[PDB]
Structures are given as structure tokens and as C-alpha cells.
Subunit: 497 residues, 4 copies
Amino acid sequence: VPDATRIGRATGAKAPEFQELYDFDAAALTLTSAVFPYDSQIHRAHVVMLTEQGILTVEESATILSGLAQVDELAATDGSLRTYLPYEAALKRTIGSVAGKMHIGRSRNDLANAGKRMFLRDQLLRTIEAVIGYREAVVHKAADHLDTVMVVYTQRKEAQPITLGHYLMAISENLAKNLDRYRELYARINLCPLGAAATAGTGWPLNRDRTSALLGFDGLVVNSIEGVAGWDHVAEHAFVNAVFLSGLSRLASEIQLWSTDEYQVAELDASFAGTSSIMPQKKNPMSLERSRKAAFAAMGPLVGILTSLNAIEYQMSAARVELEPRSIDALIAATHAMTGVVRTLHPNKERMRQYAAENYSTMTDLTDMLVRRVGIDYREAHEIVAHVVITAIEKGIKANKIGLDLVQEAAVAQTGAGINVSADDIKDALDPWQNVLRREGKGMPAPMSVKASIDDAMAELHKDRAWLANATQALANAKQTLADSVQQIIQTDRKYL
Amino acid sequence: VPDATRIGRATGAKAPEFQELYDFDAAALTLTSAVFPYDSQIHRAHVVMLTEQGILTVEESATILSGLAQVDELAATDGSLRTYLPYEAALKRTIGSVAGKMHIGRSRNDLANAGKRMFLRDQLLRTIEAVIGYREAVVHKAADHLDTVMVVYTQRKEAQPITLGHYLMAISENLAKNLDRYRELYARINLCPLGAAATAGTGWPLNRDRTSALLGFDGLVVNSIEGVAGWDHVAEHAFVNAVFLSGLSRLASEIQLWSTDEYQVAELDASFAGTSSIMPQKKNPMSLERSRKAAFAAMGPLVGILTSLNAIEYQMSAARVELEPRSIDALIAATHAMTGVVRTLHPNKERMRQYAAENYSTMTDLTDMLVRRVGIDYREAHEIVAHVVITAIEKGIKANKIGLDLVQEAAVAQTGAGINVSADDIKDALDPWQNVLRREGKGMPAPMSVKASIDDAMAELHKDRAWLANATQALANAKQTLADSVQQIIQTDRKYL
Amino acid sequence: VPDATRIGRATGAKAPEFQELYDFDAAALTLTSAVFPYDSQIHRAHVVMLTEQGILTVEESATILSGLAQVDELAATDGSLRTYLPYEAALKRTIGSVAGKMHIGRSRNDLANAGKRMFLRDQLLRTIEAVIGYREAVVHKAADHLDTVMVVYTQRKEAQPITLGHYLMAISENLAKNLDRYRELYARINLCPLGAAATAGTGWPLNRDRTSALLGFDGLVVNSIEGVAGWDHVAEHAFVNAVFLSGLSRLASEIQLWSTDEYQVAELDASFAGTSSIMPQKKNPMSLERSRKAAFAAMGPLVGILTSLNAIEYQMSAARVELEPRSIDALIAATHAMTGVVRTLHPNKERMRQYAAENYSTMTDLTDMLVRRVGIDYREAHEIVAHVVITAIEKGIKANKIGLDLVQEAAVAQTGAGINVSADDIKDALDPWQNVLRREGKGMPAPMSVKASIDDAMAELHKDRAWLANATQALANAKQTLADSVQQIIQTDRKYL
Amino acid sequence: VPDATRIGRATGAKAPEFQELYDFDAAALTLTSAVFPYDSQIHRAHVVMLTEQGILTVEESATILSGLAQVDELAATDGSLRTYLPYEAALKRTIGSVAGKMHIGRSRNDLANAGKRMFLRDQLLRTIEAVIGYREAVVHKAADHLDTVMVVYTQRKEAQPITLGHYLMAISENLAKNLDRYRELYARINLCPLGAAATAGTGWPLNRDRTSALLGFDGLVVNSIEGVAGWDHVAEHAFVNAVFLSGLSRLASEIQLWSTDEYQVAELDASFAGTSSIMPQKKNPMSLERSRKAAFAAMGPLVGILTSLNAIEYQMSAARVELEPRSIDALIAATHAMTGVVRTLHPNKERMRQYAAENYSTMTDLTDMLVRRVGIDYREAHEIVAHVVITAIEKGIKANKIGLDLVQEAAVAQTGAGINVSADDIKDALDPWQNVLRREGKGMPAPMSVKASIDDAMAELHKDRAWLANATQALANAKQTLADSVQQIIQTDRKYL
Ligand code: NA
Ligand code: NA
Ligand code: NA
Ligand code: NA
Ligand code: NA
Ligand code: NA
């Protein structure tokens, strides 16, 4: 069956990244279902630690660990077994009363905090990977557009000439700082609260560092109250998502304006646009609007979480609001969609240049030229050039057709006196490519300057990927160590005890 | 005239920190007035840099710089001169048309972004200092309460025995992470966007690193669009304030419950409480409630700022919402108030111990004892002890009066069988101080464990203060370098040119 | 399999209303699935209207309408058919190209706005029914507690004597105003935007009033742009939910404090409490905390929706955030839970009276007595009585043991002079039941006054139920008229054409 | 001194409504200063009522009332006297100890709730007046633009032809519903809580209806707890402000896009635009952006207030967040600014018509014509016309130059067959004015339909003004009755007692 939305101007298939925006809502797991596999890993790590500590015998440990595998299989289709007390009761029905010993020295409170952290930790690495991919698309696109002259806007009005590459490198710098925010957050998420038990620790001689290591954490949440009451990392995860997405909304909005029927300086790839069921002319920026929708929605978890923390004491509380899978899934869909939008965007280079040459964004360079050539102060030069623009608009003279006569008349009308500049001084000031070339300092649009920023960003992206690879491998190594330990116990009991 | 609110049970004067909560609203500056002195520093730094670059002569620079001092004095009483174009026009009226040259290579856009950053930077150091003072009060209070046995709560129900010191060290760990959040933010705030001009840089040969150094920044906002469009640091400052304050609200709420007429396990110092105009019995927790009010209000800037960023393009925009002085002033007042609340809080040690001994928080240790002594699983032990509690409540037996007979009856009623434990096993399990001593692992309430955390926090506080001293001195050194440079130019022109 | 959470002090089963809090998240529909049946009704109403207008023949109409029934059945298990263009394409595959004629004069834009309104309209009646049930439980509980003397709190400190009935009638008045907010909103939700088509109407001669009537709407959204761009009713629905739930959070918090181990003036029914997996003494207020959680979470949709409206133009936009089924489902679960909490709450009448008599809430009446009997001004009387309290606390004298000697000493200590009041004047002022009886004006706790409020609320509840019955019946009558019209067309075509 | 921002293209003076956006922040009162005059009226009304009830003698009443006038004068310059206990103490210093009797039967709690309500009530009438003025400007502008053909947008893409009048009437309908929201809120704000005293009423025999009438309230907040704990009206006021302002942001954004350099279909009046300190070409939409800024900021109070209510019990609490004068002042400034923007907006009628005729918004009418003329279904007609657009864009054919040849080729290319329509059928379908005339139903853009909506809105505006006049006069009559009563008491005591 064909995709019934791909009619008229919506040619071909949706890009996969565009389709993600339509799929995440129905596919999202509940928080309980998303965290359950991590809870199951925690049971194994806790039991292994209790065995190292002599609290459980190897025989008891093996019986429990084999039972966990059986109950996990039951829970794959029976969602009622995905919360703790139901799961423990199924374990007791499966292996007998020794099941209850897996809770020695532990609570649902530290289990819940730890499992949520493991879920958020994996989702944070998923998010960092997606943000790196977005930054890669932005920087790699910029590298092909060092000569793509176009105007930059302030207050939704044409400001001065830049290049598309220069614009994209603003987004790259935004993303670099968001990657810092997320890595900083990761260090706070990746702390283990297990051993806090209910909120006060336990008299059982746990080794909190072992459980933490077996589960891939990089350190402990030390104080036992902080271990169960601490929630600021959840609020912070919601915040970084919201602020990151606000910059994604701003880029989506920018592109939506560029691709209006009236600006027509860029066009979305067909695979990132839809159409209308009634209006056959529509090429609709549905990828952009649904990406913005995700940005706006991300405000919601942030406010709910912070409201809940403002409403309680510094205690474990079941009233705290969570960061849920569907919210993260929306962020990933929007990030992937905007990655593809940027990669595949079609700039209209001729129209971009036309606006830059014709619509008066070159007037700052004309003003700076007067100051530099005749030494007047900036305020008087500005008033002369504003008069040039006013007269040029009234007479229908595009910026690139402004000449010596119009400039002299404005100087006379505004000052009573002419001004000692040549026709060539004016022509060169009004050339939009010369406007770009003259802006050659750090962070400015001249190609040599933008290329310097690209070179720096490519080195930063290498470091971004290395950080992610290291963090991912640390978790994979820990998960394998735990799996090996579980099999050692089960098999040694089966064959030798 | 006496403070008319200090009547009846509101004895003595308000503590100064308590009075701050009443004073900040009327005393707060507008953002324009708060940022204006930083704008004036920017004018000096920009002009000095233009002089180094040969864009201004020393004579022009001296004329401008002396004029800035004159207009600054006018603006001290004439608020109409505290925005840019009015200020520049007053400068022109004061020194002549050369005033206009101070805007060469610059815009209101990069000026505004930089001045706001300098304001927020100083307010961030102010906030870090206040948060350090709060953490100092918390840790120093904890050190005097290693033996102050009391219950910890979960879900507003008595959970297990801890000490007041252990509780306070949860707050210390919360604050350590908030200090990290603020220092991480500082690195993003303390970047200079000057040289971006309108949004695209300039053809004038500025030295962006010099202006940055003269103003105490540690690096540049490199890309010129990011320099004027970037606002994520403002959202992030609002967020860290909100999350930090949510933990302050939680502590205030905790203390408010402790000091209810019904709990009566702590009492506010008289200097942090008020009374009622009608009800003479009231000792009201006004310091706590107004501190929470500031926490709730801090949600507002966070949402407004993020909404504004979600509403625009990746451009300079006058539609962005700001973080305003009154919001930061409220945070500081609440932080100071809670610092004094904690320092001066009066715990009722006898009542705290009574609740711990009598109200069943020791039942976990009774359960753990059964598991440890007779080897039953945790789930069956829990059911026996729950029956002990149910029977004890029905018969009016306080926890510390539970004995061998009641425990054996519960085992029989719930299991048909007695249980092989002694009267001394039970007595020791129900002793709340022994509950504390048994919880001796990392982050647990035993005195040796809490003291370890205190020792660590004292070392961390030394590092917190050193970071703040270094950051403050860097800004002071830069401000003196700028002041010296300005005087060099003015005096050299006056005497030698 | 037993409910594994019902162990220890969590006796019996969860109340059904309590269980609802655990079930709504996994059971919630997506918005697409929730709105789809309303979209299907819209197709029928639009087609019937087109038939009345002569745009479709009866034969074309019958073919389409029979096909809608077939595609609806396919969509019951194939979720891919629950959005418009996929559904229309399935209709074309089922009945042929005439399927396309059902879109004459219509768009996905007016369809979407109308279907969302029909969904929200039904959910608003569901919510009004639940809020009425909550108010019923509150008022009916109050009627049994006109004599249940207890203290009211301000600032979490004991204030003056009231009754439990008086307190509950505050909640009733809150709920009356929330019911007004919801009925006011209903009038704006129950307006039909169909006929706006894309945003500008259509040249086809639709009868917008007929489609509206067939779908149960009470009027039109007149202007075609407002018909597709209008979203304020969605924001308003989110707001009323949030403000209503904030009052529900406040009641839940109040009850949570009453039922602390320290206040112990009320106890939750066992069917509304849980316990701990580790601490056998816990009787945890899980119903209250999860109800508050829903209140906090309701802030999220409100902010996301308003952010999205602040981010766009006055246009149809796919970037607008929606009010989703899971949010409404949470509100209903919390409302039902709190209805059952209130109905089944167990006040400890003796302890309530003890606090009222002993903990100094009667001091206002002692002060008023001095003013009334000896004519001193209120401020001087207040200072004398504050001294009484200070001395009584120091000496360990409960309020009901304060006598003539202590009052005379306070008058002397604070004023140098005794005071001409009798022992009986004091005894009667300190009797907490007399405090209640003396407060006999409108809205005050005396039984005759509270009963007057109950009588008024019972009359209001009758009107609340009548409004709901009328609104529900109007929708049921319209749905039957539409169903009859569809069958008339299908059967007339089958037999007579 | 000239307005230094009026340089270059910022000709003339700022409009007064535009200047309001720059002035409100520094001019705003604190809440304490804004509410103080209402508190002073409450003192008079309470004292008059106590006199009617015989609680105060006429002589005591006269002494108090004359003293209130003296302390009010002191407080005009001494802000320390603007809170209750300081004010009462100044009254005692002025007239003696009888000052204390003005607090008989009252608290700061009911005083505060009532004074805030009187402040919000006046600000709500101020807001309703401003919203009526905005609606007047919108409707009166629409009446001059029934023939101003232009495109409407969906998803920021050109959709179909409408008129500027039709668009403005969408805003009028939005505003009508916001006026309903505000009048509905007024009925809840204008209820008197006085007589609740601390929270439980009083044994003094107050006449709560008299105090209410003297202060202009229309009814009571009956239950005494609701009288002091009730705050939902504050949250609701914040919400209506936020939702109303979101529609104002959307109109501002719409106009900002219309007035881009690229759309250029409208131009702001010079008096509502600014310029740049650096870029002389700028005509910046500063009125629009600062209006949007106010909209975004209005989210903040809404969230803070609701957070505070979610954080407490159903009690009087000093932790509740308030709606502050500066927030309302911002709303009024933005509403006035947008009133002037709309009144003075300059549409470019020729460019609006050009886009409507050339940029393919007429394609729906071409599609509807095929269905109507040859009877094909809507889906097949849509596919043919989409091909027309695709081919026309590729060949550079503007919509109004599409003819029979291009339509037949598209039918053949997409269907293998021609289509039986004439050149005149096509020409008439592509005429944008005929597109408007054909859309003649309720709420559609044809002039006769828009004029019907204007006639209805003019009748509604008459009713809006009558409601406001009645509500205002009721408050003025009450204030005069109170003033007369105060003078009666003072003068009768002076001359006859
Ligand atoms: Na950070
Ligand atoms: Na954290
Ligand atoms: Na930043
Ligand atoms: Na309403
Ligand atoms: Na509405
Ligand atoms: Na209300």
C-alpha cells in the first residue's frame, strides 16, 4: 500500500528521518517498560555483590540468578511483572522463598533511582550521538557553501551580507555548547545510588563500589538521602533537552522563512516536505513544523519536574514527575529530521545573491567607507546613507544601481555639502561579495575566516566522537563483566557444588 | 520607630537575612540600570582597543574617554541617558562630533549582549559566594550534630533512624552539584561577543582578543551570529537558579514540617520567625515561606526565556526575554535567609530521640535481625514484623516496649511457628542509636561515616572558595588594567600632545 | 495471582479508584486513536450535509456511507488507517473513485480542528462528571462532621478551632468555581469549525449549520481563519485542568499532613494506602502522592500549548501542541482517587479535639474576650495574651489549663496592672467548642452556619447534575439523528434506487 | 532634547503607544505600593461597618477615620507605612490606642486577600477597556478593507485568496472570546472575603454584606477558609493574560512577516518602527518584537502562581506567588501598541493582489472547477492540478498566465486523457477576486460575508462597552457612598457629639 500522503507535489517517499516524526508517539514505551530491563540488570549486580560479600552463598546466588532469567522471559509478554513487588513474587513462585533474599540491603527506592539513571544514561548517549550527527551535517554543509553569498537577518529584516557557510557555523557553535551541557550532565547522571536502601543505608555489609562498577557507573551518589531524594539530574536532563531544542526550533523557523513563497531563497528537499489534501500548489514544511512542535512540547516535562521538586521535602517521594521515554523519543526524531533537512537543503544561490545585491544590506559598508575615506564620524555618515536609502526606495533604485549622483544629493540634502568620494569607492562598497571579503576577522563571513572555524569544528567533532566512544565502551565492558560473573556463578553451582 | 511586626512571640529584631526577604523587591534595579555601568566599561574598552589598532588617534581617544566620565556622571541622576543612542547623543553634546567615532566597528547588538553577560557574570559570582556560604552553614551545623539521633522521612512518614548531621550532609552534596552547575555555566557566560557588531562582524580591523581581555572575559563567542543571537546562557542561568532554589524550597519545607506544633522536633530562632496580627499564639515560619515563594517565582523567568527562544529564528531579536535583577536578588535573599535559618536552628534533641525510639522506625533493623539470625528470607521476615507493628499499635505498645512475647505471637499468628531469637536480640534491634551505629557504610548515618563526608566537604569547600577567589581576582585585575589604560591616554594627551 | 503490593500493613485490595492511578499510563490512547472515531462521525455528517445540498446524489452518498462502515472496521485493527489521507485511500480501494467526493468543500484542517473539539467535548463532560462526584463526596462527608472539632492551620501552624465539616466546605466552594470554569469552557469548545475548509471557506454551497447540528455542536466558529487557526480553547482546557488539580494537590497535601505519624489526626483507609518493600511499619499515602504527581504534570501541557501559540502566526499550523488523552486520563484517575480518599477518610476525633483544646488555637477568643469585657484595644489585648502563651509554654501548661492566675500575671508583667475578668470568662474563652459556636456568621464553622452552606451546596449540586444531563442528552440525540440519517440514505438507495 | 533613537529611517516621533513599551518597566509600582490605597479603603469600610454594628461608637469611629486620612498622607512619601502593622502603629502614634480597635474582627489575611482583589479588579477593568480598544481598531480597520484582496497562509505558505478585512475579522472573533474569558473571571475576582478574619471568621457580629457593598463587591467569598486560602482567581487572571497575549503575539508575528523585505505586502507606520545604530537601511519592527516579548514574559507569572499553589495545603500561606503590577502594565503597553499598529498599518494593495494572482493560491478553485464541470472526484482533480503547478513552476508560468494548453497537457500527462473544460472556465477559476467572491458563506472572505461579520461585531462591541460602563459605575457609586459615610461620621462627631 502506497504512502497516501505522497500525492501531488509531495513526490517520492518521505525521508526516513521525516517519517520518524510520525512514528515516535505510537511506538514510545512507558517509563515502566523502558526501565524494566535496567532493573533486571540491577538485580543481577546486587546479587553478585551480595555473593562477593558472603551475604548469599554461591548456591543461593545461582538459584536466584537462574530464576531472574526465567522471570525476565515471562515479563517480555506479561507487563504486570515489570514493577518490583510483582516481579519478586513471580521469582518466589519460580524458585521458592530464596527469591526474597535478593532484596537484602535494598529498597524499591534505591532500585528505582538507579534504574531511572541507567535508562537516562543510555538515552543521554543516544542523544549525544544524534546531536553529533546533527553537528556533522551542519559543518559538512557549511564546507560546501563558503562562497554562497546571502543576507543575514536581524529582527526579521535584511541586515548585512554573509554566506550560508557562515550562518551554519553559528549553529555549529551553538551545538558545541549544547554538547558540553550534555556531557556535564552525564557526569551527574552516571553516579550510582545503590546502597542507600530506603534512604538511610543498611546494617548489611554491602560493597557499594562493586555494585556501581558492575553497572557501569563512574562513582557513587554518596549520601543515602541524596541517593533516594536526589532528582536534580532529571530536571537538568529536561532542561538541556529544552534549550537544545529551542535552538533547533530557531533553525527550523529560519529555514521555514527562507523557503516561503516570498523569500524563495531555499527549498526543502521533496523528501522533507508534504502537501495539502485540498490545495494542490502546497509544498508544506511539515518536517520543520513538527520539529518545532517537539521543541515546544519539551517545555512541559521541564516545568512538571521542577514543579514537583518545589512541592515536596528533601525526601524520597512518589510525587516527583519523571522524564519519560516519549519525550526523549520526540527529541531524537526532531534532531534526525533536522539533520536530514540541513544535509539535503537546496539553496537558491542566484536569488540569495540578488537580494544581497539589491535590497540595501550593503549600506553599512557604504557608511564605513565614508568614515574611512573622509573621516566624518559614524553618526553623520549613517544619516547621509539613511537618506540614500530613503531616496533610492522612493525612486525605485536597487542598491546595486546606487551611484555617485544619488550619494552626493543625499550628502547635500542632509548636510548642505557634497562629499569627497569616487564612483569606484561607492561601487566597491555596494558589491555584496566585497562586503563578505572585507569581514575577515574571527567569526566573520569571509571564506578564510569561516574555513578556520570549520577546521576547528572538525577537530572538535573528532573529540566529540571520541568522548562518546569511550563512554559507550565503558558501559559495554561493564555489562559483559556482569554477564560473565552471572554465568560463572550459575555454572559453578550446576557442575561443582 | 520600632519594627511594628516584632510583637508578641516575634521577639527581638528580624535577623538581617530575614529582613532581606522584605527589602529586595522595592530595592531592585531595572535591567537597564543594572547593565548601564557595564556598558560604560565596554565603551572604554572598545575605545582603547580602537586606539591600539590605530582607528582612533590618542587625541580622539582622550577626548572620548574624558567625555565618557562626564556623561556617566550625568547618567547617575538622569536615567534617560542609560540606553545607548541617548548616551551617545549626550556624549556628542558634551565633546562634539568625535563622540560618534566610539561606535566604529560596533552595534547596539554586540554591546547589549556583552553588557548583559558582564552583569550576569558578576551576579553569578555573587550567587556562587552566597551558595558557598549556605553550604558552609550546612556543613558546620552538621559537624555539631553527629550524635543528634532523629528519624528520616520518606513520603512524609517516619522511615528509619539517622542523625541531623547525616541529613544536613544530603543538602551539602546537593549544593556541591549545584556549585558545579554554576561554575560550568560561568565558563559559557564569560565569553566576549564584542566584534560581532550587528551580526556579521565588520571591515574595521578590530582586535577582538584585546577588547575581551580588557573586560575580563576568558575567551570569545567566535561566530558573529552566535555573538548576537546566542542566548542559551541566559536560559541556563535561569535554569540553575530554578533547580538550586527547588532544593532550597525542599529544605525549607522539611524544616517547616519539623517545626509544626505537632512534630515539634525543631524550632526556628526567634529572629527568623514572625507572628500574627490577630492570633497571639503564632510563631510563624515566615522566613521559610518567603524563601519557598522565591523558589516558585524562579520558574517564571525560566519559562519566559525559553518560550521567547522557541518563538524566533537564529537571529538577533528584541523579542527575547531577559533574566532580570529582581529575580537574582530574590534568590540571594532566600539563600541568605536559609543560611541563617540553618545556622540558628534549634533541634529538640529529646523529642527527636523519643520519636526515633517510639514510633516504629526501628522495624527494619528488627526484620534484618530475623534474616541474619534465623536465615529466613527478607519477604517472610517483613510480614512477621508488619504484624508486630499492627498488634503494637492496636495494643498501644510503643516500639521501644516491644519484647519477646509480642514478636513470638506475631511469628505464630503469621507463620504458625515461633522464631529462635532472644530478648537481647530484639532489644538491640529496637535501640535507635544502635540502628544508627549499624548503618556505617559510605553515606550512611553512623558518626564515623558522616564525619568522613564532613572531612571531604570541608576540603571541597576550600576548593570552592579558591575557584571564586581566582575568578573574582581575574575580573578585578582586568578592571584595573582598563582604568590604568584610560588614564594613560587622557593624561598623555593632556600633557604631551 | 495476588496483588503483590498488598503485604504487611497494606491490607486488603487497592480501592478501584487507587488502582486507576497505576493503570492510566499504559492504557492511554494516542491522540490519533482517540480522535479517529470522531473523524469517522464527521465524515458521515459532512456527507449527509452534501447530500442535503445536492452536491452528492443519494446514490453517491449511500456508496460512500456504506464504505465508511467498512473502512472503520478495517481501522479497528489497522492503526495506519486512522489518519485522513490513508483512510480516504482505503475508502477508494473499497468503493472506487467516488470516495474522493467525500472531501468536496473540506480540508484536513477543519476536519482536524472539529475532531479534536469533539474529543475534548466528550472528555470535558467526563471531567465535569468526575468533578461533580468529587464535590458530592466532599459535601456528603461534611454533613457527617458538623461536630468534629479540629484546628485549622495557616502557614502550617495551628490557627483557630473549626470543624472538619467547615474545612470540607471550603473545598466544595473551590469546586463550585472550577465547575463554572469548565462549563464556561464547554461553551467555547462546543462550536463547529467545519466549513472553514483549508482556512478560507469554499465556493461549494455548504450548509454549515446542518453539519454542526448533526455533530451536536451548539454554534459555529464563524470566521474561517478562526475555524482552523483557533486553539485558545485547547490552552484553556489545559489551564482549567491545571488550576483544578492544584486545588486537589492542596487537599491531598493537607490530608498527608493530617495523617503523618506526628499529627495523627486522620488515617487513610487501608484501601488507599500502600507499604514499603523494606520498612514493615509503613502505611504510605501513595494515593495522595500519585494524585499530586498528576497535578504537577498537568503544568506541562499548559506550558507546551501556550509556548506553541506564542511561536507562530494567526494561521493553521502543524507546530501547535495538543492536549493529549493521557493527560486527561491522569486527571480523572486523581479525581476518582481523591473522591474515594475523602469518602473513606478516618478522622481521629479525640486527637483532633485534644489539639484544639491544648495547643493554643483558642488564644484569639481569649484576646477578643479581653477587648469585649474590659474595652481595651485589640493590640494591647494581643500583647497580654502572647505573654500568656509564652509563659504557658515555658511552664508546660496546656491551653485548657490556663487560668485566672496566669492571665493576671501576664497582664501585670506586660502592663503593670491586672485585668477585670473572671475565671469563668477565661474558661469559656478557652473551650474549643465554644470557639466554634461563637463563629456563627456566613462561612464560619458553627454547625448552623456550615449546615446552611451544605444546604446551598446540595441545591447547587442538583443544578450541576442537571446541566451535565442536558449537555450529554443533546450529544446523544444528535448522534442518533445522524445514525438514522445514514441508514435512511443507505437503505433507500439499496431498495428504491 | 530630541529622542536620540529617531534617526535615519526612524522619522518623526515614536507613537505614544510605542513609547509605552519603553516606559512601563521603570514606572511600574511594587505590588505593595499598588495595593496600599485599596487597603486604606478597606480600613474605612471595615470601620464604618463596625460602627453600624455597634462595635465602635461614632466617636471612636470618627477618631479612627480622621487618623486614617493623616496616616495615608504620611504614607504618600514614607513607603515603610504601606504594610499593615507599620500602618497601624503609625495610626496609634497619631490618634492613640483606639487605633487598635480598627482590627477588631479582622486579620492581615482577609485584608490582604481583599486588597489584592480590589487591585486586580481595577486592573481587569483597565484590561477590558484596552482589549475593547484593540478590537475596535481591528474591526474599524477591517471595514475599510473588504476589497483588499490578499493571500491567507497556512504553515507559512500561500494558501488561498482572502481579503485583509476577512483576516482582521478572525482577530475580532478571537478577541470576543477573550473578552468573555475576562468578564467570566471578573465575576470571580469581584467577591469579598472580608469577615474570614484569620481563616475561621470571628465571634464579633460583623455584617459581611455591608463591608462588601461599601467596597463595590458583587457577592461574598462565603467560606472563611476559601476567603483566605483561595487564590485560583489569581492563577486565572495570569492565564487569561497569557492566552490573550499569545493571540497578540501571533498577530504581531503575522504583520512582521507581511512587512519583511521579501514579502513587502504591508509596511508599519514610521511611528511604530525604529532603526539601527549601525545599519542605515533598517526600518525595524520594534513595536512588534517588544509586544511579543510581553506575551512570552506573561508565561512566567502563570507558571510561578500555579507552582506555588501546587506546593502548599488548602491554607492561607505566605508562599503563594502574586500577579504583579509590572506584568499587567506590560500587557497594557503591548495591547495599546498593537492597537496603534493595526490602526496605522499600510497595506501594499498592489503587491497583495500580485501575489494572489501569480503565486498559485488560486489552484483550489481550478480543482473545484474540474470536479464541478466534469464530475471527476476531488482526489483525481487535485492530482491534475498539482501537475499544472509543477509544470508551471518549471516553465516560469505565473498562475494568472496558466491557460487551456497547460491544463490539457497536465490532464494528459497524469491521466492519458484530456478534460472537457473551456479557456473561460480556467480564466475565471484563476481570477483571485472571483476566488474571493465565490467564498460567500458564513465566515468566508466575500465582501458581503465579511460585512455581515462586521455588523455583528459592531453590535457586540456596543455590548462590550455597556458591560464595562456598568461595572465601572458600580465601583464609582460604592466609592462615593463610602466617602459620604466617612464624612458623615467625622462631621457628626465634630459638631454634635
Ligand atoms: Na552544566
Ligand atoms: Na544531580
Ligand atoms: Na551558551
Ligand atoms: Na471562564
Ligand atoms: Na476559544
Ligand atoms: Na476563584
